Scaffold this active site. Structure first.
Site, mmCIF file in Angstrom:
data_model
loop_
_atom_site.group_PDB
_atom_site.id
_atom_site.type_symbol
_atom_site.label_atom_id
_atom_site.label_comp_id
_atom_site.label_asym_id
_atom_site.label_seq_id
_atom_site.Cartn_x
_atom_site.Cartn_y
_atom_site.Cartn_z
ATOM 1 N N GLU A 131 -7.260 2.559 -5.257
ATOM 2 C CA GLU A 131 -7.582 2.638 -6.711
ATOM 3 C C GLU A 131 -6.393 2.236 -7.624
ATOM 4 O O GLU A 131 -6.074 2.903 -8.615
ATOM 5 C CB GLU A 131 -8.039 4.055 -6.993
ATOM 6 C CG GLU A 131 -6.940 5.118 -6.862
ATOM 7 C CD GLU A 131 -6.971 5.899 -5.536
ATOM 8 O OE1 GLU A 131 -6.564 7.111 -5.520
ATOM 9 O OE2 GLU A 131 -7.391 5.344 -4.510
ATOM 10 N N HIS B 68 -16.627 4.311 -5.936
ATOM 11 C CA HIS B 68 -15.561 5.240 -5.628
ATOM 12 C C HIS B 68 -14.231 4.834 -6.296
ATOM 13 O O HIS B 68 -13.581 5.659 -6.945
ATOM 14 C CB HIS B 68 -15.372 5.274 -4.130
ATOM 15 C CG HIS B 68 -14.352 6.273 -3.686
ATOM 16 N ND1 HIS B 68 -14.697 7.549 -3.276
ATOM 17 C CD2 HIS B 68 -13.006 6.176 -3.531
ATOM 18 C CE1 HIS B 68 -13.603 8.214 -2.954
ATOM 19 N NE2 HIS B 68 -12.575 7.393 -3.045
ATOM 20 N N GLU B 69 -13.809 3.577 -6.137
ATOM 21 C CA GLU B 69 -12.518 3.222 -6.745
ATOM 22 C C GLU B 69 -12.565 3.307 -8.260
ATOM 23 O O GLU B 69 -11.603 3.682 -8.896
ATOM 24 C CB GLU B 69 -12.050 1.830 -6.310
ATOM 25 C CG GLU B 69 -11.998 1.684 -4.785
ATOM 26 C CD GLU B 69 -11.135 2.735 -4.062
ATOM 27 O OE1 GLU B 69 -11.328 2.963 -2.843
ATOM 28 O OE2 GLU B 69 -10.247 3.330 -4.690
ATOM 29 N N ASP C 129 -0.209 10.143 6.776
ATOM 30 C CA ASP C 129 -1.043 9.144 7.490
ATOM 31 C C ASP C 129 -1.677 9.705 8.777
ATOM 32 O O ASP C 129 -2.798 9.327 9.132
ATOM 33 C CB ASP C 129 -0.252 7.875 7.867
ATOM 34 C CG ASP C 129 0.149 7.054 6.648
ATOM 35 O OD1 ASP C 129 -0.689 6.940 5.701
ATOM 36 O OD2 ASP C 129 1.243 6.432 6.574
ATOM 37 N N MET D 295 -8.853 0.621 9.056
ATOM 38 C CA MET D 295 -8.588 1.663 10.095
ATOM 39 C C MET D 295 -9.813 2.472 10.495
ATOM 40 O O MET D 295 -9.923 2.896 11.653
ATOM 41 C CB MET D 295 -7.507 2.613 9.588
ATOM 42 C CG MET D 295 -6.159 1.904 9.641
ATOM 43 S SD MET D 295 -4.783 3.012 9.568
ATOM 44 C CE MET D 295 -4.864 3.626 8.039
ATOM 45 N N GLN E 261 0.875 -1.174 0.000
ATOM 46 C CA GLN E 261 0.000 0.000 0.000
ATOM 47 C C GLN E 261 0.915 1.228 0.000
ATOM 48 O O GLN E 261 1.432 1.614 1.056
ATOM 49 C CB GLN E 261 -0.909 -0.026 1.237
ATOM 50 C CG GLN E 261 -1.639 1.327 1.543
ATOM 51 C CD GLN E 261 -2.550 1.704 0.384
ATOM 52 O OE1 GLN E 261 -2.520 2.836 -0.102
ATOM 53 N NE2 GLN E 261 -3.271 0.724 -0.129
ATOM 54 N N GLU F 30 -9.852 13.259 -4.008
ATOM 55 C CA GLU F 30 -10.976 12.621 -3.330
ATOM 56 C C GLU F 30 -12.327 13.324 -3.458
ATOM 57 O O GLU F 30 -13.355 12.666 -3.533
ATOM 58 C CB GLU F 30 -10.638 12.351 -1.857
ATOM 59 C CG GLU F 30 -9.329 11.561 -1.665
ATOM 60 C CD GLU F 30 -9.430 10.155 -2.271
ATOM 61 O OE1 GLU F 30 -10.548 9.728 -2.431
ATOM 62 O OE2 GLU F 30 -8.427 9.502 -2.498
ATOM 63 N N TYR G 133 -12.372 14.372 1.520
ATOM 64 C CA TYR G 133 -13.543 13.705 0.879
ATOM 65 C C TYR G 133 -14.828 14.545 0.941
ATOM 66 O O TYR G 133 -15.506 14.746 -0.101
ATOM 67 C CB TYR G 133 -13.864 12.388 1.576
ATOM 68 C CG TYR G 133 -12.749 11.412 1.444
ATOM 69 C CD1 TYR G 133 -11.607 11.494 2.246
ATOM 70 C CD2 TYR G 133 -12.822 10.387 0.511
ATOM 71 C CE1 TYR G 133 -10.544 10.580 2.091
ATOM 72 C CE2 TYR G 133 -11.793 9.462 0.384
ATOM 73 C CZ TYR G 133 -10.657 9.559 1.162
ATOM 74 O OH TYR G 133 -9.638 8.638 0.979
ATOM 75 N N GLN H 196 0.241 4.501 -1.269
ATOM 76 C CA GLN H 196 -0.310 5.814 -0.981
ATOM 77 C C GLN H 196 -0.247 6.171 0.524
ATOM 78 O O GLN H 196 -0.600 5.337 1.347
ATOM 79 C CB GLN H 196 -1.775 5.927 -1.434
ATOM 80 C CG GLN H 196 -2.216 7.372 -1.556
ATOM 81 C CD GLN H 196 -3.680 7.505 -1.862
ATOM 82 O OE1 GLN H 196 -4.528 7.219 -1.010
ATOM 83 N NE2 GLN H 196 -3.988 7.970 -3.036
ATOM 84 N N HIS I 62 -11.908 6.879 -9.488
ATOM 85 C CA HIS I 62 -10.485 7.260 -9.496
ATOM 86 C C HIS I 62 -9.807 6.971 -10.819
ATOM 87 O O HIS I 62 -8.769 7.569 -11.140
ATOM 88 C CB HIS I 62 -9.701 6.533 -8.369
ATOM 89 C CG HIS I 62 -9.755 7.215 -7.033
ATOM 90 N ND1 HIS I 62 -9.351 8.534 -6.876
ATOM 91 C CD2 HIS I 62 -10.187 6.799 -5.824
ATOM 92 C CE1 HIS I 62 -9.491 8.887 -5.616
ATOM 93 N NE2 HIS I 62 -9.957 7.843 -4.947
#
Ligand code: KEL
Ligand code: YB
Ligand code: YB
Ligand code: YB
Ligand code: ZN
Length: 610
Positions: free
Chosen positions: A271, A295-296, A375, A564, A134, A318, A383, A136, A299
């Site tokens: 994405e 949503h994905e 992060d 998360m 991951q 976003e 968003y 991003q 992108h």
């Protein structure tokens, strides 16, 4: 107009730019390392260029080769979460536009923040390990040396050596597989990404994967145990791609596959081009969490084609994607449904602002990330404040059909580029030149750069929200003698989305009296609902209202998955409950070493442990 990427220690795009990565690596599960060579084709943007700088984080560099010989390089001192700059001394000075190939031999650390290495016990099948990435925002540099900034876009090819029982996939078109010449217990999977992308979109999975076809350009990939359920859950995918192409213009990436990760995947979705990664907590059984796929998919235009130039401009990625996500869901399910989701997003924005506080710099739309780890700053703000701004603009400028015209033109304008908020605003003014007087009414400085809730709330149709609000108000104003009037029939006309909204409304006024929550369990049996979004909000309501019976339920959901969105607040709420505090901390300490590295860091900060 001077803009540099403060999250990157590499040479910026004005000095040199990476055009291509050819990655040849081997995945070493015994050692938890990825080892290989990153050959970067780099174009100088300057006369007389003699050195350049790359981002690295926790990488071991064996050597750097240009023109067949080893060259000098040096690693700077680590700059906390940014990592360590790698300066490379070029053997011959380059003229402007000259391109060379730099081959860097490297090895990752087991603790790479880009990676999670899973033992067989942590998988569905229990026989094989699993790896996923991951990158991003800025973890690509924890996988390989690169100009780790979305202001630079490159194409890539990769040959990945893996144990032969396992399958590798990437954010790229599969380009074949063969036995490994230098170790027959192994296979090489090959990959080609022909569309220039920012390095945060480079993605790799390796594990015991199987696939099933679910549309003309879509396979679903997961472990065998999840295949059938994922196929059903994500069956609207092709129909969403068709609506998205209508809104965005042509899908340019070839394939749109889905990969369902193990439960510790930290996000709802990511994405990655050609291969969207999703959490298995979407597998509700009724396709009700499919907005995440919408949503994905979106992108594939806003984010992957038109990209934020630096992470300070993340809302561009976003807010536009949420705006298109909500249109896809609006086309499938009606305009009243788009408004319902839009109105829910305003409430998530209220939550986030209330949580950081109304003058906190992370509540600004455009953030300054100098010395802030992306992060840490990550929230619903870009968003929902980004979506709120777009929906306000839609309403100001004449409605969805007109604003959708602007969106498509925007994507056509900025395809294959990286842009700032000022690029977006300039084009917005250009596109709507006949409506500048309207545009000049917007309080730009407040919407873009001020903390807190936006200066103006858009208009929202309330039809589907009203039932949620009424039921939540009934519960909040109930006294003991009113609890008997509640019954399972209160819920009979509510969709899962409406039940989720009833819980969100009620959670905003938490705690409730403990007897209310017990009655809610007696009549509605929310403990039985496996839908992750509904179960998350219900457990949070139970913990914040001090129901001890809910402690083992909340702990089990916090640790048995690692999204998360759910794990961080569950742990935070458990720590804030005196009865569960010692156990929340203990459970974190015990699980930490086998958590995802970013999740482990953030939960640690949330609990104030270490
Ligand atoms: C807070 C977190 N957000 C995400 O996972 C979003 C990540 C993303 O922006 N992908 O494109 C994708 C997403 C967008 C909209 C709704 C749900 C997830 C989460 O949901 O776990
Ligand atoms: Yb091929
Ligand atoms: Yb009463
Ligand atoms: Yb400690
Ligand atoms: Zn997104």
């Amino acid at each position: 107009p001077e803009i540099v990427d403060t999250c990157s220690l590499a040479s910026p795009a004005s000095v040199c730019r990476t055009k291509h990565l050819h990655l040849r690596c081997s995945v070493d599960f015994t050692r938890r390392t990825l080892t290989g060579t990153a050959a970067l084709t780099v174009q100088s943007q300057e006369d007389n260029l003699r050195s350049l700088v790359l981002d690295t984080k926790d990488l071991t560099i064996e050597k750097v080769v240009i023109n067949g010989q080893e060259v000098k390089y040096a690693l700077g001192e680590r700059q906390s979460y940014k990592g360590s700059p790698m300066e490379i001394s070029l053997p011959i000075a380059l003229s402007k536009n000259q391109e060379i190939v730099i081959e860097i031999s490297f090895e990752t650390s087991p603790k790479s923040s880009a990676l999670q290495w899973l033992t067989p016990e942590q998988t569905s099948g229990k026989e094989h390990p699993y790896l996923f990435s991951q990158c991003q925002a800025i973890h690509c540099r924890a996988i390989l040396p690169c100009q780790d900034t979305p202001s630079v876009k490159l194409t890539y090819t990769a040959e990945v050596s893996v144990p032969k029982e396992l399958v590798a996939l990437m954010s790229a078109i599969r380009d074949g597989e063969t036995p490994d010449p230098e170790d027959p217990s192994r296979k090489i999977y090959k990959f080609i990404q022909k569309v220039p992308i920012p390095c945060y979109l480079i993605a790799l999975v390796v594990g015991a994967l199987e696939s099933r076809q679910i549309g003309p350009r879509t396979l679903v990939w997961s472990e065998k145990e999840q295949v059938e359920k994922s196929a059903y859950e994500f069956s609207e995918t092709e129909s969403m791609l068709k609506i998205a192409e209508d809104l965005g213009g042509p899908y340019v990436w070839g394939q749109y596959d889905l990969l369902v990760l193990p439960p510790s995947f930290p996000y709802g979705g990511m994405e990655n081009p050609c291969l969207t990664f999703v959490t298995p907590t979407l597998l509700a059984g009724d396709k009700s969490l499919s907005n995440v796929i919408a949503h994905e998919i979106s992108h594939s235009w806003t984010g992957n084609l038109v990209t934020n130039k630096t992470w300070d401009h993340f809302w561009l990625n976003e807010g536009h994607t949420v705006y298109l996500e909500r249109h896809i869901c609006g086309r499938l399910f009606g305009e009243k449904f788009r408004h319902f989701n839009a109105l829910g997003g305003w409430g998530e924005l209220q939550n986030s602002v209330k949580t950081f506080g109304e003058t906190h710099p992370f509540t600004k739309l455009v953030v300054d990330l100098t010395d802030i780890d992306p992060d840490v700053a990550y929230s619903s703000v870009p968003y929902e404040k980004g979506f709120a701004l777009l929906f306000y603009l839609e309403q100001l400028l004449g409605g969805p059909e007109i604003f959708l015209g602007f969106l498509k033109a925007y994507v056509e304008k900025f395809s294959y580029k990286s842009i700032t908020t000022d690029d977006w605003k300039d084009f917005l003014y250009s596109y709507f030149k006949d409506k500048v007087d309207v545009l000049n009414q917007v309080d730009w400085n407040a919407w873009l750069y001020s903390p807190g809730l936006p200066p103006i709330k858009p208009n929202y149709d309330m039809t589907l929200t009203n039932a949620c609000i009424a039921l939540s108000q009934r519960w909040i104003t109930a006294k003991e003698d009113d609890l008997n009037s509640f019954n399972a029939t209160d819920l009979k006309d509510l969709s899962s989305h409406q039940l989720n909204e009833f819980l969100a409304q009620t959670l905003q006024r938490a705690p409730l009296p403990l007897g209310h929550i017990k009655r809610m369990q007696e009549v509605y049996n929310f403990n039985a609902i496996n839908n992750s979004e509904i179960r998350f909000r219900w457990l949070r309501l139970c913990i914040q209202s001090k129901w001890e019976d809910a402690i083992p339920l909340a702990l089990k959901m916090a640790t048995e998955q690692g999204r998360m969105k759910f794990t961080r607040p569950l742990f935070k709420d458990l720590a804030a409950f005196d009865k569960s505090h010692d156990q929340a901390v203990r459970t974190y300490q015990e699980h930490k070493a086998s958590m995802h590295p970013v999740t482990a860091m953030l939960v640690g900060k949330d609990l104030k442990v270490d």
